[PDB]
């Protein structure tokens, strides 16, 4: 709530994601522009476990995304939240890779 400590990663291509049924697939296709194409995060330094960092990226990215979202006067269903979490998770992982050297 005090902000700070976050860095912003480069923009990423939205992957085609399949959700296992016809409705979520169509729903996803239609609604995905409303979900993030970037992630918020704290450096690597602060995490010795990629499995964590990813958690600290999905929830953070989504709250911050909703506050900026509440401003435009629109609302998220429960499905949006599920779909948004899943794709940002994919994104955080790619983001995690960023350092290999």
Curated annotation (Swiss-Prot):
The normal, monomeric form has a mainly alpha-helical structure. The disease-associated, protease-resistant form forms amyloid fibrils containing a cross-beta spine, formed by a steric zipper of superposed beta-strands. Disease mutations may favor intermolecular contacts via short beta strands, and may thereby trigger oligomerization. Contains an N-terminal region composed of octamer repeats. At low copper concentrations, the sidechains of His residues from three or four repeats contribute to the binding of a single copper ion. Alternatively, a copper ion can be bound by interaction with the sidechain and backbone amide nitrogen of a single His residue. The observed copper binding stoichiometry suggests that two repeat regions cooperate to stabilize the binding of a single copper ion. At higher copper concentrations, each octamer can bind one copper ion by interactions with the His sidechain and Gly backbone atoms. Glycans are attached at residues 59, 75. It is linked to PrP is found in high quaPntity in the brain of humans and animals infected with the degenerative neurological diseases kuru, Creutzfeldt-Jakob disease (CJD), Gerstmann-Straussler syndrome (GSS), scrapie, bovine spongiform encephalopathy (BSE), transmissible mink encephalopathy (TME), etc. One of its GO terms (molecular function) is copper ion binding. Belongs to the prion family. It is found in: Cell membrane; Golgi apparatus. Disulfide bonds join 57-92. The keyword Disulfide bond applies. This is Major prion protein. One of its GO terms (biological process) is protein homooligomerization. One of its GO terms (cellular component) is side of membrane. It comes from the Eukaryota. Its primary physiological function is unclear. Has cytoprotective activity against internal or environmental stresses. May play a role in neuronal development and synaptic plasticity. May be required for neuronal myelin sheath maintenance. May play a role in iron uptake and iron homeostasis. Soluble oligomers are toxic to cultured neuroblastoma cells and induce apoptosis (in vitro). Association with GPC1 (via its heparan sulfate chains) targets PRNP to lipid rafts. Also provides Cu(2+) or Zn(2+) for the ascorbate-mediated GPC1 deaminase degradation of its heparan sulfate side chains. The keyword Membrane applies. Keywords: Amyloid, Cell membrane, Copper, Disulfide bond, Glycoprotein, Golgi apparatus, GPI-anchor, Lipoprotein, Membrane, Metal-binding, Prion, Repeat, Signal, Zinc. Monomer and homodimer. Has a tendency to aggregate into amyloid fibrils containing a cross-beta spine, formed by a steric zipper of superposed beta-strands. Soluble oligomers may represent an intermediate stage on the path to fibril formation. Copper binding may promote oligomerization. Interacts with GRB2, APP, ERI3/PRNPIP and SYN1. Mislocalized cytosolically exposed PrP interacts with MGRN1; this interaction alters MGRN1 subcellular location and causes lysosomal enlargement. Interacts with KIAA1191.
